């Protein structure tokens, strides 16, 4: 039985004959939408996916240092300049050094020096975006067997088939629903995250724009490259080592994400729907009424929403048969007061002692639940608020 132990539930009602209900849908919830002379129905939004996530940025957290130079000049000799200065794959740093008869200069003073180095990326982590075109909602529909559908904003029409109950139609999408205008899908090694735009755009590491192709073009390369202590013609260059833990410590919070495979699952939903169930058919109002008896194999327990779950066991060859199940204040005799959530219930196992669960919505105050008809019928008292 669905929505039995589910916390975030919502037993929203429906119209009988007119097939239009307001169905809000959240991630990891339930919407028990019953109806007319049609089987009660559970619509649950389970998954939210996003494929084709375009790369917004990539930060290098472990850099590699490559071929490096050092052009120096004597004082009053002008400024220095290297080959690969204008080269975008190189990071450089100009400075002035002590020059004299010691180094190899005739004059004493401050001589020019420029040092360059080629940049590489050992490991980079990537931030991807989330468009409403990406988003895709896998949704489960059960008889309260259960078919699963998928609504892509590019095709918001679905139709599921469930056993001898016919079919359920579905039509949704509320334009920009739970809109992830902000929020980036940040994948590091193999672990993923959902971080905020601003926090991502302000990360103290080298970075390039879109994907790759033929060598990116990291910016702010001197975030992982430090020019240390010149000499006259030689100034040193150092990389800062891998920065995995430095990121890990900063990302101890962000709402983690899972995926499989390349499709990224996110825990969020919201989706307004308008579905039609004309092709819904109970099953068979041609089943004969159950003649035998029952048993409270589980004591009539209350839900948190006010409804009552009830468990019976049928000792009869008679099945498949319709279960006589109702409620009454009169008891003599003997009309119904409340309603069935599990509307028009049916035992389908043939022999022998066949169990079944039921959900019912009792009237305010004292009422008695009745399972079976006439002789050997079960009754149980129940109060409501």
């Amino acid at each position, epitope marked *: 039985i669905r929505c039995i132990g589910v916390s975030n539930r919502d037993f929203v009602e429906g119209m009988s004959g007119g097939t239009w209900v307001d169905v809000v849908l959240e991630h990891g919830g339930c919407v028990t939408v019953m109806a007319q002379d049609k089987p009660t129905v559970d619509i649950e939004l389970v998954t939210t996916t996003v494929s084709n996530m375009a790369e917004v940025r990539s930060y290098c957290y472990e850099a590699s240092i490559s071929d490096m130079a050092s052009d120096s000049r*004597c*004082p*009053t*000799q002008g400024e220095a300049y290297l080959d690969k200065q204008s080269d975008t794959q190189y990071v450089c740093k100009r400075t002035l050094v*002590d020059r*004299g*008869w*010691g180094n190899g200069c*005739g*004059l*004493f*003073g401050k001589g020019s020096l420029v040092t360059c180095a080629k940049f590489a990326c050992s490991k980079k982590m990537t931030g991807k975006s989330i468009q409403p075109e990406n988003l895709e909602y896998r949704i489960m529909l059960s008889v309260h067997n259960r078919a699963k559908v998928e609504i892509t904003p590019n095709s918001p029409r679905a139709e599921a088939t469930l056993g001898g109950f016919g079919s359920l139609g579905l039509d949704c999408e509320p334009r920009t629903g739970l809109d992830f205008s902000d929020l980036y899908y940040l994948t590091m090694n193999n672990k993923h995250w959902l971080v905020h735009k601003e926090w991502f755009h302000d990360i103290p590491l080298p970075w390039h724009a879109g994907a790759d192709t033929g060598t990116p073009h990291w910016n702010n390369k001197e975030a992982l490259v430090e020019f240390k202590d010149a000499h006259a013609k030689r100034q040193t260059v150092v990389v800062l080592g891998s920065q995995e833990g430095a990121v890990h410590t900063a990302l101890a919070g962000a709402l983690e994400a899972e995926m499989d495979g390349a499709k990224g699952r996110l825990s969020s939903g919201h989706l307004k729907c308008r579905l039609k169930m004309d092709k819904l058919r109970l099953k068979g109002v041609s089943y004969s009424l159950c003649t035998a008896a029952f048993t409270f194999t589980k004591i009539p327990a209350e839900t948190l929403h006010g409804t009552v779950t009830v468990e019976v066991q049928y000792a009869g060859t008679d099945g498949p048969c319709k279960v006589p199940a109702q409620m009454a204040v009169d008891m003599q005799t003997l009309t119904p007061v409340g309603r069935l959530i599990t509307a028009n219930p049916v035992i389908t196992e043939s022999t022998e002692n066949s169990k079944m669960m039921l959900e019912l919505d009792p009237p305010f105050g004292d009422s008695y639940i009745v399972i079976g008809v006439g002789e050997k019928k079960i009754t149980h008292h129940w109060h409501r608020s």
Partner: antibody, heavy 116, light 108 residues
Framework: VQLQQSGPELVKPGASVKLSCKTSENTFTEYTMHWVKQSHGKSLEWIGGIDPNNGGTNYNQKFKGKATLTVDKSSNTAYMELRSLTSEDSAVYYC??????????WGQGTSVTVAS | FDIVMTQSQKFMSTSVGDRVSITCKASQHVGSAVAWYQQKPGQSPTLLIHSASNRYTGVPDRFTGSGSGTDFTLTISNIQSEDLADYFCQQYNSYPTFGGGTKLEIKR
């Protein structure tokens, strides 16, 4: 001695004097000219230098204003001009040339006597 | 700033065939940017050692330079008559400065 310096000088106190030093008997302009004062008590003292290419000077702070080094490229003739002289400017002025190391080659010096 | 080069010995005596060691003490670190200069009386100074221990052309191996950091010693072995002169040190790490000078006297 690859360096010919000017002859001695007698200068009246106050007056200015220009000393000369000449070099280079081959096309090798990558060297430098420097000037060194030797006062009595045989104490040496670096006055300043000059690149004969661009003309890059470089004076000892002690001799800023007092000395002015200028170069004549084509003749390979370096010049050092003193000004507003006193008796404590009276000394032997050597000129030196750096090619590889420190003061690699010295002239015989120019004796400067500042007196009325 | 300026860098003081100190030679404690104003004078120093020796005879032919002996060994003398003049000491130059820089007040500040000048590494190996030190030169030495011989000046015979009447003549002009000449380069002997440079780089602090490497001797200049013509100079016999009797003349040995050494030292680093702040202290440098010019050592003359098998001293001859013609060796009498003034000996100067000179840092060229910063603005050139010379030592006070050390006169080598010969005894006989």
């Amino acid at each position: 001695v690859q360096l010919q310096q000017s002859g001695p000088e007698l200068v009246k106190p106050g007056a200015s004097v220009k000393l000369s030093c000449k070099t280079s008997e081959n096309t090798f302009t990558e060297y430098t000219m420097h000037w060194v004062k030797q006062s009595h008590g045989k104490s040496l003292e670096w006055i300043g230098g000059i690149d004969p290419n661009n003309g890059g000077t470089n004076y000892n702070q002690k001799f800023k204003g007092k000395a002015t080094l200028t170069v004549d490229k084509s003749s390979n003739t370096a010049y050092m001009e003193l000004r507003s002289l006193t008796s404590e400017d009276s000394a032997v002025y050597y000129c030196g040339r750096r090619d590889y190391y420190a003061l690699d080659y010295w002239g015989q010096g120019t004796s400067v006597t500042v007196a009325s | 700033f300026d860098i003081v080069m100190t030679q404690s010995q104003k004078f120093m005596s020796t005879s032919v065939g002996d060994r003398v060691s003049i000491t130059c003490k820089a007040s500040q670190h000048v590494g190996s940017a030190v030169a030495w200069y011989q000046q015979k009386p009447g003549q002009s100074p000449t380069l002997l050692i440079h780089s602090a221990s490497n001797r200049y052309t013509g100079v016999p191996d009797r003349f040995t330079g050494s030292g680093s950091g702040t202290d440098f010693t010019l050592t003359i072995s098998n001293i001859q008559s013609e060796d009498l002169a003034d000996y100067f040190c000179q840092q060229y790490n910063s603005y050139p400065t010379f030592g006070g000078g050390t006169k080598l006297e010969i005894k006989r």
